[PDB]
Amino acid sequence: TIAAAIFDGGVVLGADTRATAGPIVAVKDEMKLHYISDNIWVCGAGIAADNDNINAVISAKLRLFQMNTGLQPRVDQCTNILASRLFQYMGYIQAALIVGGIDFQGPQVYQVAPHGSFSKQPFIAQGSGSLAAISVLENRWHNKMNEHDCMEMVADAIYAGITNDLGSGSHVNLCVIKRENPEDKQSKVIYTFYKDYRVPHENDRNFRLEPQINNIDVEVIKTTERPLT
Amino acid sequence: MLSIVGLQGPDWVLIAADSSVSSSIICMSENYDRIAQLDDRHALAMSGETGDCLQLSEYLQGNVALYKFRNGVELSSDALAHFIRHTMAKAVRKSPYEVNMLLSGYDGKPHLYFMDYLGTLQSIPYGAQGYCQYFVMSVFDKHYKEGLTLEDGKELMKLALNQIKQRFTVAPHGFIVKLVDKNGITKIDLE
Amino acid sequence: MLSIVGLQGPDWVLIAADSSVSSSIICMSENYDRIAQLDDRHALAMSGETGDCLQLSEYLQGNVALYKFRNGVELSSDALAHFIRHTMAKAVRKSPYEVNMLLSGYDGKPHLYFMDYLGTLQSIPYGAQGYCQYFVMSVFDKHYKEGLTLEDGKELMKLALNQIKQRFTVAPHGFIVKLVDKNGITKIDLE
Amino acid sequence: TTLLAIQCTDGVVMASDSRTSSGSFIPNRATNKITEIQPKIFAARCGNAADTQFLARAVKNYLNALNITRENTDDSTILVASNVIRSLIVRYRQYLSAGVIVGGWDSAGPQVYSIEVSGMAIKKKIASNGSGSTYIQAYIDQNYREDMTMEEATKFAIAAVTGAIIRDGSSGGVVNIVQINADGAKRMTVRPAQQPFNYDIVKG
Amino acid sequence: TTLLAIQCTDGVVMASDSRTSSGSFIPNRATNKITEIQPKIFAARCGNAADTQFLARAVKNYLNALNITRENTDDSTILVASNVIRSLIVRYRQYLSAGVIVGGWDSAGPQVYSIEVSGMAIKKKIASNGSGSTYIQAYIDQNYREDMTMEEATKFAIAAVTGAIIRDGSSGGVVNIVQINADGAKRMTVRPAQQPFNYDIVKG
Amino acid sequence: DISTYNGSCVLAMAGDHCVAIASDRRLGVNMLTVSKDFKRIFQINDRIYLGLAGLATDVLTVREQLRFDVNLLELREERPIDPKKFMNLVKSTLYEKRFSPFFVTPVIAGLLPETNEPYLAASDSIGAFAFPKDFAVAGTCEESLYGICESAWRPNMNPDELFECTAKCLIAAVERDSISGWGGIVYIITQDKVIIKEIKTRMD
Amino acid sequence: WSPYEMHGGTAIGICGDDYVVIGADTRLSVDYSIDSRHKARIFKMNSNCMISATGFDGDIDAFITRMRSILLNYENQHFHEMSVESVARCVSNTLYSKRFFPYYINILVGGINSEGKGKLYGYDPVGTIEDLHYDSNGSGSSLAAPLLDSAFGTIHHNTRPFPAVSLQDAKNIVRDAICSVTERDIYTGDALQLCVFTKDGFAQEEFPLPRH
Amino acid sequence: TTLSFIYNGGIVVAVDSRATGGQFIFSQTVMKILPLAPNMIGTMAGGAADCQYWLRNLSRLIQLHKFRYQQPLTVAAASKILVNELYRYKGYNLSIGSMICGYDNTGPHIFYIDNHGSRIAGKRFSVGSGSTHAYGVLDTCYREDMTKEEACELGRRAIYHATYRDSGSGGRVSVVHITQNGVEWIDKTDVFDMHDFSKTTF
Amino acid sequence: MQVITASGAIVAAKYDGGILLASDLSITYGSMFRHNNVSHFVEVAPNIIIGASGEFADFQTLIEVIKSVILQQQCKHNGEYLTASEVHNYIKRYMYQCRSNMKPLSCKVIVAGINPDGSKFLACTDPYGASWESDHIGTGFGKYLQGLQIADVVNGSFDDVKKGITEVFRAVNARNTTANGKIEFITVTPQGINHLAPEQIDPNWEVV
Numbered sequence A: 001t002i003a004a005a006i007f008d009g010g011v012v013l014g015a016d017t018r019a020t021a022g023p024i025v026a027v028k029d030e031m032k033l034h035y036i037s038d039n040i041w042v043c044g045a046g047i048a049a050d051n052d053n054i055n056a057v058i059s060a061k062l063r064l065f066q067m068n069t070g071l072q073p074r075v076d077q078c079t080n081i082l083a084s085r086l087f088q089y090m091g092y093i094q095a096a097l098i099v100g101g102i103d104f105q106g107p108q109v110y111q112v113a114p115h116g117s118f119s120k121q122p123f124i125a126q127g128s129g130s131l132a133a134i135s136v137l138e139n140r141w142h143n144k145m146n147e148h149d150c151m152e153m154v155a156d157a158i159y160a161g162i163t164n165d166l167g168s169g170s171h172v173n174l175c176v177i178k179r180e181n182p183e184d185k186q187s188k189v190i191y192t193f194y195k196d197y198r199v200p201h202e203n204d205r206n207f208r209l210e211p212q213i214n215n216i217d218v219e220v221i222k223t224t225e226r227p228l229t
Numbered sequence B, C: 001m002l003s004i005v006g007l008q009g010p011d012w013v014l015i016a017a018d019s020s021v022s023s024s025i026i027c028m029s030e031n032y033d034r035i036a037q038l039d040d041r042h043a044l045a046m047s048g049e050t051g052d053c054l055q056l057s058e059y060l061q062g063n064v065a066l067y068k069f070r071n072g073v074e075l076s077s078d079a080l081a082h083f084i085r086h087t088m089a090k091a092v093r094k095s096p097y098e099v100n101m102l103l104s105g106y107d108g109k110p111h112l113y114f115m116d117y118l119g120t121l122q123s124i125p126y127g128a129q130g131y132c133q134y135f136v137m138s139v140f141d142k143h144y145k146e147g148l149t150l151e152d153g154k155e156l157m158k159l160a161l162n163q164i165k166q167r168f169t170v171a172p173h174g175f176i177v178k179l180v181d182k183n184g185i186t187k188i189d190l191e
Numbered sequence D, E: 001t002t003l004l005a006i007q008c009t010d011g012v013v014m015a016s017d018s019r020t021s022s023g024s025f026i027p028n029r030a031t032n033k034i035t036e037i038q039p040k041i042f043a044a045r046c047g048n049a050a051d052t053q054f055l056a057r058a059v060k061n062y063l064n065a066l067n068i069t070r071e072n073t074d075d076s077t078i079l080v081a082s083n084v085i086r087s088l089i090v091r092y093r094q095y096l097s098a099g100v101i102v103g104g105w106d107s108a109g110p111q112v113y114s115i116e117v118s119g120m121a122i123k124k125k126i127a128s129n130g131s132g133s134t135y136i137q138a139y140i141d142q143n144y145r146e147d148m149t150m151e152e153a154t155k156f157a158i159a160a161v162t163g164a165i166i167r168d169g170s171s172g173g174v175v176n177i178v179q180i181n182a183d184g185a186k187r188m189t190v191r192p193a194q195q196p197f198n199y200d201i202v203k204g
Numbered sequence F: 001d002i003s004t005y006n007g008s009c010v011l012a013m014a015g016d017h018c019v020a021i022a023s024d025r026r027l028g029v030n031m032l033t034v035s036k037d038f039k040r041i042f043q044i045n046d047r048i049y050l051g052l053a054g055l056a057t058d059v060l061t062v063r064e065q066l067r068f069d070v071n072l073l074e075l076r077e078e079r080p081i082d083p084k085k086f087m088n089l090v091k092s093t094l095y096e097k098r099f100s101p102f103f104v105t106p107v108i109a110g111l112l113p114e115t116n117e118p119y120l121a122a123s124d125s126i127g128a129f130a131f132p133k134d135f136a137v138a139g140t141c142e143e144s145l146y147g148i149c150e151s152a153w154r155p156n157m158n159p160d161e162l163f164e165c166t167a168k169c170l171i172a173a174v175e176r177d178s179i180s181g182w183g184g185i186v187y188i189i190t191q192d193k194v195i196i197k198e199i200k201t202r203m204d
Numbered sequence G: 001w002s003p004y005e006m007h008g009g010t011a012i013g014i015c016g017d018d019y020v021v022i023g024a025d026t027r028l029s030v031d032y033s034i035d036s037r038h039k040a041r042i043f044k045m046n047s048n049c050m051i052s053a054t055g056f057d058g059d060i061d062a063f064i065t066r067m068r069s070i071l072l073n074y075e076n077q078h079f080h081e082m083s084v085e086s087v088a089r090c091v092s093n094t095l096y097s098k099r100f101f102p103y104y105i106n107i108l109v110g111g112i113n114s115e116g117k118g119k120l121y122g123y124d125p126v127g128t129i130e131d132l133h134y135d136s137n138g139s140g141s142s143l144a145a146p147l148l149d150s151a152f153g154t155i156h157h158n159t160r161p162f163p164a165v166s167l168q169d170a171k172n173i174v175r176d177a178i179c180s181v182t183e184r185d186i187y188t189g190d191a192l193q194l195c196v197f198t199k200d201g202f203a204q205e206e207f208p209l210p211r212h
Numbered sequence H: 001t002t003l004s005f006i007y008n009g010g011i012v013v014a015v016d017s018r019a020t021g022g023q024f025i026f027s028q029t030v031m032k033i034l035p036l037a038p039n040m041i042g043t044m045a046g047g048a049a050d051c052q053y054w055l056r057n058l059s060r061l062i063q064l065h066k067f068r069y070q071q072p073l074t075v076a077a078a079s080k081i082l083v084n085e086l087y088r089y090k091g092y093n094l095s096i097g098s099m100i101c102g103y104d105n106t107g108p109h110i111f112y113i114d115n116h117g118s119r120i121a122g123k124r125f126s127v128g129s130g131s132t133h134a135y136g137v138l139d140t141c142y143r144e145d146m147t148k149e150e151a152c153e154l155g156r157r158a159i160y161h162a163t164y165r166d167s168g169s170g171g172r173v174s175v176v177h178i179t180q181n182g183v184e185w186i187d188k189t190d191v192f193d194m195h196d197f198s199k200t201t202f
Numbered sequence I: 001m002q003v004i005t006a007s008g009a010i011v012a013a014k015y016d017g018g019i020l021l022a023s024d025l026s027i028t029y030g031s032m033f034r035h036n037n038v039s040h041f042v043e044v045a046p047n048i049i050i051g052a053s054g055e056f057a058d059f060q061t062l063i064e065v066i067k068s069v070i071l072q073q074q075c076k077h078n079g080e081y082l083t084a085s086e087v088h089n090y091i092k093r094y095m096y097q098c099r100s101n102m103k104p105l106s107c108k109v110i111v112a113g114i115n116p117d118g119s120k121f122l123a124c125t126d127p128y129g130a131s132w133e134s135d136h137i138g139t140g141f142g143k144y145l146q147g148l149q150i151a152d153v154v155n156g157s158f159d160d161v162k163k164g165i166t167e168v169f170r171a172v173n174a175r176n177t178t179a180n181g182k183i184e185f186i187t188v189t190p191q192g193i194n195h196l197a198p199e200q201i202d203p204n205w206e207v208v
C-alpha cells in the first residue's frame, strides 16, 4: 500500500513497509518512499527491485539535471521520465509509482503505471492495498486540506491497506513535501520524512517465548579461525 | 513397447519376450515372464504397461479356461486369436488395452498372430511387437527358410534377439523364449 | 543424458563414459569415446546430445591447446574446470550447452569435477552425469575408501558400471574407462 | 472510455469521460483523456493509457519535428498529428492498442481526425471512440447535426458522453470538454452534478 | 441482433431486427427473432438461433405443461414463461447461449421480462438485448418514456431498432414489431424503405 | 523448477558487533545429492561475506562477477569495499540481469568498517535488498529460516550465542528442506577474527 | 476452474503426555484479502478429540460437518464417543473418500486416548495419517515446522524419545510459533485459537495476532 | 526409499521415513511398512495416502479372506488382490509403489506392486525416489548367505545411502525381518546416526 | 464462475439496532449499466434478508432455492421461518455443493438477519461455499474499497455504521466501474426489514 495526496501547501506521500517474497513477508521495514529530489519523492508498489532501481535511476537523472541545468526537477518532469522509462519496458519493470512533489506549478501527485501510463491526481493509492487506501483518500481528501489533515488521511489510507491487504503491512512511512514557508510559494521545497509515522501496536508481535525451548544440539565437525585481515 | 518376438515354424512357434521389467529407469527384475501361457497350447507374448499386460493376460487366460471348462473343448489358435482380437477391439472402442501381443499357439498346427493393441489380428510366420519389430523382421526375412528345423528356428530366434540386444538402444537385459509345439509351452534357453 | 561416471583416487581418476552412441532407438556404435581428452592431463567425460558434446569438446580442447601454446604453461585442473564452467555459464545464459560433464584431471594431483550443463562446477571424489548418478553414487558411497589403490579404484568403477548395466533400464552396451594420472590419460579396460 | 470530437463551424468540441478502468477498479476517475498536443491540437485518447499517452507524447514530438524546418507552425498540424498518430498506431500495431481522436484548430480551420486502434486515420466532423461511445452511437446519429455550433456541439457532446458514462462501466466521472477555436482551447469539466442526466434515465 | 420490448400502458411492443449473422454472412436477413410462444406471449430471441429457438420451443412446452393441471391458462403465463426461460438458460448455461425478452399480455396485463444470457430474469418496462441494442442504449435512455402508449412505444421501438440496425452489422433488415394488447398480438414489418432513417444518419 | 534445482539454505544473522553467515553444504541436482562440499558463502573481504543461495551455476557466476567487481573497485580505490557499497554492487549486479535474472539470492553478512556493527543485506534474485538488523535468510529453506529465526533471534548475541543460533536456526531449516542440508558451515565474523565452524546437520 | 480457494492460515499441533495443544490462526483470507478475521479453524469434535483444519474454508466446513456427522453416528451406534484414534482413522478415511476430489484441507486430530495420553495426527488433503507429536499445517507450515523441530529436535534425532514439554510450554511454543508465522506469513494472523485437549477436555483460548 | 530383499535367512524390508511434499520434508517419522498379515508386510512408496490407505484395505481384504476361508492367503494372493484393487483405479492417478513381502507356505515372497498394475515377483526390490541408491547398495553388498544382523544392516545401509543421495528419502530406517516365524520389526535407526562423519567423501 | 449480469458491491455492518446492508440497485452486463432499481437484497424471512454480489442469475437461483427451503420448513413448522443462521447454513451447503458439482454460483451471498434469540446474524458464503460470520461483510469492491470505515464503527450507532457504509460506498462509486445508481440501505432489525430511501452517495468531484 502506497498513497499520496496533495494538501494546501504540499504533498503527503505514504507507504507501508512490507515487502513480500510471494506469500511470505520478506521485509517488515522496507522503504518504498524514495527521495528523487529535494522536491520530489516517489512511493512505489510492484516488484521491489523494479521500484528501487527505477526510483534510483530517475533520481540520478534528475540529480544530474539539477546539477547541470541548476533547475529544480519538476514533478511532471520526473513523471514523464518515469513514464517513458516504464513504457519502453512495456510494463516489464513492475513499478507502480506515485510521484509526489512540489515545483513552480505547486504540489503535484502523479501515478505512473508499470506500463508507462501516468496521470496527475489530487490523491492516488497504488499497490495491493490501493483499494483500501483509496477508500480512505476518497472519503477524506478535499481541496486545500492542511498538512496535518493530509498526513493523517494518507497515514490512515496506508493503514487501511496494511489492515485489509495481506500484501501490505508493518509500519506507515510518510513523506511530506512542503515549502519551508507556506505563505511564500517561492520558498524552498523541503521534505520531512516520517519514518514509522504509524507503528500499529496491534500488528506488533504480542507474544515471544523468551526461554526459547531448543532441542537441536549443534555438533561442530570443524572449527577454523582466521584473523579479520 | 517392450520387445516381444515370434517365429512360427513348420510345427512349432518360438515366442520370445523381454524378460526384464523396469520401473522407469530402474530394471526391477530380469526374469519377468511376459509370455502369458493362456493355455497349455497358447503363449501370448505381451508388450506394454506391465499392469495392463498382466490384467489382459489374466482376463484372457481366465476366459480360455472358462471356455475349456464350460465347453469341454478348447479354443483353437485361430479361435483364441479372434477372441483376443475381439477383446482388444472392444477395449480400444471403450478403454484400449495398451498391449501389443504375439499369440503363439499349437492346436495341432503352429500359429503365430500379430495382435496390436487396437485389435489388429494377423497370422504371421514371424513378427514382433515393440521396437524390436524394426530390428528383427529383416533378420527373419533374410534368414527364415520354409520348413525350418526347430534348431534352425532357435538359431534364427537367437539371431533376432541378438539383433535387438546389439542394435536396439533400449536393449533388454535378456529374453524369456518359449517353444509352443505339440508338447505344449516350454521355456527354452537359446544358447 | 548418457552415463558418465567418475571416481577420483589418491593419485588418479577413473573416468568412464557410455561408449555406445545411438540414433534414437538404434545403437549406431558401441565404442564411441565420450571422454574427450582436452589435454594430456584432462579427460572430460560428456553426457548429452552427441553433436553438442562433440562441439563443446572441440571448443574446450582447442581452448586448452590455445592456452598451452599462447601461454607456455598449461591450465590447471582447477583452472580448466573453471574455464569449462565459465563456458557453460555463458552458454546457459545465451545458448545452453546441453552437456553434463565429469572433468577428470591430473595436474600433479587428481581432480574430478561435476560440471552440469548450467555451469555447476563442483570438485567431487566421485560422481556421475546422466541417470547413472542415481545408480552409482550409493555404490561409491558404500565402497569408496580414502586412499584407494588404483586396482581397488578399478574394482569400484567396475562395481558402479555393473550397477548401471544391471539396474539402469537404458543400460549402455559398454563403457569406455580412462585412467587420468601422472602418466596422462590411458584407456583402461575394467576386467 | 468515451471520446466524442465534433468539428463544428466555429470550432472543435472534444468531449470525453474521465474514467480510467483497471478491470472493475477505477485507478483514475478524473482522467484527462483529451491530451493537449499543442494549444489548439488535442488528442482524445482511447485504449491503453500507456499506449495513448505515448502516442500523444510522440505526436507532440513529431509536430515539433515538423516545425524544425518550417515557420508555418500552424499549417497542416492537425492533419500531420493525425498522420503521425496513424503511423505510430500502424508501426506499433503489435504493441500499441490505442485509438486517438486528434481534434483542434490550425491554419486549415477546425479539424477532427479519428485514428482508430487499427491505425485508420479518417477526417470526421463527428468522431466517437471508446467502449462508451458504442452506447451513444444511435444517440449521436439522432442528435448530431452537421450545423451544430461549438456551443450546440458542446451541449450535445456533454449529453452524449453522459449517456455513455451512465451506460458504460468503463466510462464515468466528469465530462472533460475541450472547445478549440481559432482563439485557442477552453477546457471545461462537467461533473456528475452538472451533467444533463444521470443513472436515473436507465429505465426511466 | 437488436431486441427491444417496451411494456406500455396499453400493451407490449417487441421490436427486433431480422438479421441472422453467420460471421459476416447473413444466412437469414428476414429472421423473425420474436417467437410467438402463445397468441399473446412472444419471445424476442438473442444469441444462438438454435439455443434461443430451443428456448422458445421449451417455454411453449413448459407453458402447455403449466396448463395441464389448470384452467386459468391466462394467469402468470408471461411470468412463468420468463421463469422457465431463466431456468433453461441457467440449466443449459454451459450449452445454451441465449437471452430472451419474453413480452406480451396475460391476466396480469402487459409484461416484459428480460432473461439475460446469464439466466437473469428481470421484469422490465423497457428491455433491450443483442449486440445492436448496445448502440441504442443512450438513445433509449433519452427517448424512452414510461408513459409511452403502444403506438408511441412502437414508433420509438422502430426508431431504436433502426438505429441499432444502422450501427450494428449483426443487426439489420426489417424491424419486426409485435404489439400485444389484451385483444391479441399484431405483427408489423418495417422494411428498410419504411424505417424512419437509414445509413445516412451516420455522420449526418 | 530452476530455483530449486540446487537446494540452498543461507542464513546470515546479527549478533553483538558480530555477524554470522551459515549455509548448507549440499550441492544437489534437484533430489540428487551431488556433493556435501558446496561453497555458497564467500569472503568478499575481511569483513564482508556473501552467502549465495540458489543455482550453483548462478552462485558461482555471481560470486565471480562480484569478485571481479570488488577486486577492480578495491584496486582502483585502494581500500576494501564497504558492506553497504558491496550491497549496492550486488544490487547492481543482480538488476543488470533484471530481464534474465540470476537464480541466486544473496545474503551479505559483514561488519561495518568503523563501528563493527553487524550488517545484513538479503535480496531477491534481482537485487531488491532488505537490511534486517536480526537475520537474513535465502534459499529453498527461506520460509523455514524465516520462522525459526523470527522466534529464535535475540538482540546482542555474542559470537558463541550467535553461532549457536546460526547453527540451530539453520539446522532446523535445512532438516525441513529436502533439497538443502548435508552439513552446515557458519562463518562468525567478529570485530577481530572469523570463526568458520562446520556444523553437523542431517545428511538425508 | 479450481473448486478451492486455498485460503491459508496456519495450525500448529503439539501432543504431550496428557495434552494436545493445537493453535490455529483464525484468519480466513485469500488473494491478499481477508474474508474473516475470526473464523475458528479448530473444532471440538467430541469429548476425546478436536480437529484443526487449514486450507480451503469450504472444504474445511464440509469436512468438519462430515466428521461431526460421522462422530454423531458413532456415538449413537456405539453409546461411547469416538476415540481420538477412531476419529483419526475416520479423518483419514474421510479425506481419502475424496481422494480424487480432495478436501484441500490439512487436518490435525488432537485428542486424548483412553489411556489419557495426548494423541496428535497430521494429515494431507488426501488423507495420509501421521501419528505425530507435533505438526504444522497451512500457509505458515513451512515457517512453523522448523520452530517445532527446534523446540523438540525430533526431526534432528527422530529415534530419540519425544521431549514432551509442559502443557504450558507446549502452549507457549504454539503461541510463539504462531506469532513468528504471523510476522512472516501474510495469511496467518488476526487471532490465535489455542485449543487444548486434556483429560479435563477441550479448553479454548483466543490470543490477538498482528492483523496486517 | 523402500526396499525388500529375500536372502537365505528371510526377508529384510528396510524403509526410510521421510514424507516430502515438493521440497519440504513434511515428516521424518512416517511408517512406510504396513503389516498386512502375521507373516506379511506391505511397503509404502508414492502417494502416502494412497499407499497407506490401500495397504490398509489390502489388510482388510486379507483378514476377510482369512476369516471367510481356512485356506491361508499367500503373499502372491495379497499382491494380486492389491494390484487388482489398484488397477480398478487405473487412470485415477493413484501413486502406490509397494512391496508385498512375507512368508507363506511356499516360503519367502516379495511382489513389487504399483498403481500401474505391475506385480513383479522378486528376491530384491527397491521402490521410491532413492530406489536407485538402495539398489546400488543391495546389488553390490547383497549375499544370499548373510546373517540376520548382516541382512538387516544391508537393508539399513541401502536405505541410508538412498537417504543421503536422495532428497526425497530420509528420516529413520525402519527395518523389519520377516521369517516363517512372522514379521520381526527389527528397529528404527536414525540415518543421521548411520552417517559416518569420519568420512569426508560423503 | 462466470459473472455476466453482476450485482455490485454489498456492504453489510452490524449496528446497535440491527444489520445495515447497503448496495446499489444496478445490475451490470459486463461493464454496461444494464438494469437499474434491481435490489441486490431479497427478504426471505421477516427478519432475514439475503443479498449477493456477482452473477445475479445465480443469486436468483439461490433465492429461489432459499425460498423453496424456507417454504418447506414453514410447512413443517406451521409457517415458522428458518433462522438467519439456518438460512445461511443452507446457503453455505448449497453453494459448496454447487462448487463441488463444478457448477458454482458465481455470487458472494450475504445473509443478514435477526435470529429468534435476537442476535444479529451477518454471514457470507463465497462462490466456492466458503462461509464466515462477521459483524460486517463487504462483497465485491465493498470489501476492497473498505479500509477501516466499517471496522471502526461496526456495532456502533446506526448513524456511525451508516456513515461508515456511506464512506465505503462513496469509495465504491468513485472507484468501481460497475457501481451505478443510488445505494439502497436496508436495516434488518428485530422489528423487521426496513428499506431506507436509496441515497446517491457522491464521490468528491472537486478532485478534478
Ligand SMILES: *C(=O)[C@H]1N[C@](C)(CO)[C@](C)([C@H](Cc2ccccc2)NC(=O)[C@H](Cc2c[nH]c3ccccc23)NC(=O)[C@H](Cc2c[nH]c3ccccc23)NC(=O)CCCCC)O[C@@H]1C
Binding pocket: A001, A002, A015, A016, A017, A018, A019, A020, A021, A022, A026, A027, A030, A031, A032, A044, A045, A046, A047, A048, A049, A051, A052, A094, A126, A127, A128, A129, A130, A161, A165, A167, A168, F098, F101, F122, F123, F124, F125, F126, F128, F129, F130
Ligand atoms: C501495497 O499495496 C504494497 N504491496 C507490496 C506487495 C509491497 O510490500 C508492494 C506492492 C510492494 C512494492 C515494493 C516497493 C519497494 C520495495 C518493496 C516493495 N511489492 C513487493 O514487495 C513485491 C511484490 C511482487 C512480487 N512480484 C510482483 C510482480 C508484480 C507486482 C508486485 C510483485 N515483492 C518483491 O518484489 C520481492 C522482494 C523480495 C523477495 N525476497 C526478498 C528478500 C530480501 C529483500 C527483498 C525481497 N521480490 C520478488 O518477488 C522477486 C521478483 C523477481 C522478478 C524477476 O508495495 C505496496 C506499497
Ligand SMILES: *C(=O)[C@H]1N[C@](C)(CO)[C@](C)([C@H](Cc2ccccc2)NC(=O)[C@H](Cc2c[nH]c3ccccc23)NC(=O)[C@H](Cc2c[nH]c3ccccc23)NC(=O)CCCCC)O[C@@H]1C
Binding pocket: G102, G104, G106, G122, G123, G124, G125, G126, G128, G129, G130, H001, H002, H015, H016, H017, H018, H019, H020, H021, H022, H026, H027, H030, H031, H032, H044, H045, H046, H047, H048, H049, H051, H052, H095, H127, H128, H129, H130, H131, H162, H166, H168, H169
Ligand atoms: C524413497 O526414496 C521414498 N520416497 C518418498 C518420496 C517418501 O517420502 C516416498 C516415495 C513417499 C511414499 C510414502 C509412503 C508412506 C508415507 C509417506 C510417504 N512419498 C511421499 O512422501 C509423497 C511425495 C509426493 C508428493 N506428491 C506426490 C504425488 C504422487 C506420488 C508421491 C508424491 N508425499 C506425500 O504423499 C505427502 C505425505 C504427507 C504426510 N503428511 C503431510 C502433510 C502435508 C502434506 C503432505 C503430507 N502427502 C501429499 O503430498 C498429499 C497431497 C494431497 C494434495 C491434494 O517414499 C519412498 C519410501
